[PDB]
Paper text:
The Eph (erythropoietin-producing hepatocyte) transmembrane receptor tyrosine kinase superfamily, with its first member identified years ago, contains 14 members in mammals and is the largest among all receptor tyrosine kinase families. However, the cytoplasmic portion of all 14 Eph receptors are highly similar, each containing a membrane-juxtaposing kinase domain, a protein-binding SAM domain immediately followed by a short carboxyl tail PDZ domain-binding motif (PBM). In this study, we performed systematic biochemical and structural studies of the bindings of three SAM domains, two from previously identified Eph-binding proteins ([name] and Odin) and one from a new Eph-binding protein discovered in this study (SAMD5), to the SAM domains from every Eph receptor. Our study reveals that the Eph SAM domains have exquisitely specific target SAM domain-binding properties, although their overall SAM-SAM heterodimer formation modes are very similar.
ITC (Isothermal Titration Calorimetry) experiment revealed that [name] SAM bound to [name] SAM with a dissociation constant (Kd) of ~2.22 μM at a 1:1 stoichiometry. To elucidate the molecular mechanism governing the specificity of the bindings of [name] SAM and Odin SAM1 to Eph receptors, we determined the crystal structure of the [name] SAM-[name] SAM complex and the Odin SAM1-EphA6 SAM complex at the 1.5 Å and 1.3 Å resolutions, respectively. The two complex structures adopt an essentially identical End-Helix/Mid-Loop binding mode, in which positively charged residues from the N-terminal end of α5 (End-Helix) of [name]/EphA6 bind to negatively charged residues from the loop connecting α2-α4 (Mid-Loop) from [name]/Odin, forming the well-known tail-to-head SAM domain heterodimer. A noticeable feature in both complexes is that the backbone methylene of a Gly residue at the beginning of α5 from Eph SAM (Gly954A2/Gly1104A6) is in close contact with an aromatic residue from [name]/Odin SAM (Trp1221SHIP2/Phe738Odin). Taking the [name]/[name] complex as the example, a special cation-π interaction between the Arg958A2 and Phe1226SHIP2 was uncovered by the high-resolution crystal structure. The guanidinium group of Arg958A2 forms hydrogen bond network with Asp1222SHIP2 and His955A2 on one side and with the backbone carbonyl oxygen of Ile917A2. As such the guanidinium plane of Arg958A2 (and its delocalized π-system) is in the same plane with the π-system of the planer peptide bond between Ile917A2 and Lys918A2, forming energetically favorable π-π stacking with the benzene ring of Phe1226SHIP2. Whereas the rest of Eph SAMs contain a Lys in this position except EphA10, which is an Ala. Based on the structures shown in Figure 2F, replacing Arg958A2 with Lys would eliminate the planar π-system formed by Arg958A2 and the Ile917A2-Lys918A2 peptide bond and thus seriously weaken the binding, even though the positive charge at the site is retained.
Author numbering: 1196 to 1256, 906 to 970
The structure:
Amino acid sequence: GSEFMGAWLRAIGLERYEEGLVHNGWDDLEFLSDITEEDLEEAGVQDPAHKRLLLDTLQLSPFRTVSEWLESIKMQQYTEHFMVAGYTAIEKVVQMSNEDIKRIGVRLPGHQKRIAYSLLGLKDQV
């Protein structure tokens, strides 16, 4: 979580990077595990040893409706964005591309990625 991630970063000496991660949508420890080196660079983590430590540490440890699905990944702030753009049923959201996710107003990379990873699992399920 946003506070929990701050403590997690502080525990490994990477508190300096909290603001940049959070500002890029990497704001929840539960979903940080899919972050890549490239994502880190984009979020302000330039130092190779700092990226390595963050990534090494992460190694250690059917929905009926669109709103229910978004709630499961803590992305309910975007429910109206999806609904007004016509992505109003699970059978519609599973067809979305990364370009569609951005177009409808998901701007933060960590949120874009969270949604895209989650859709893979949904598509597999349906």
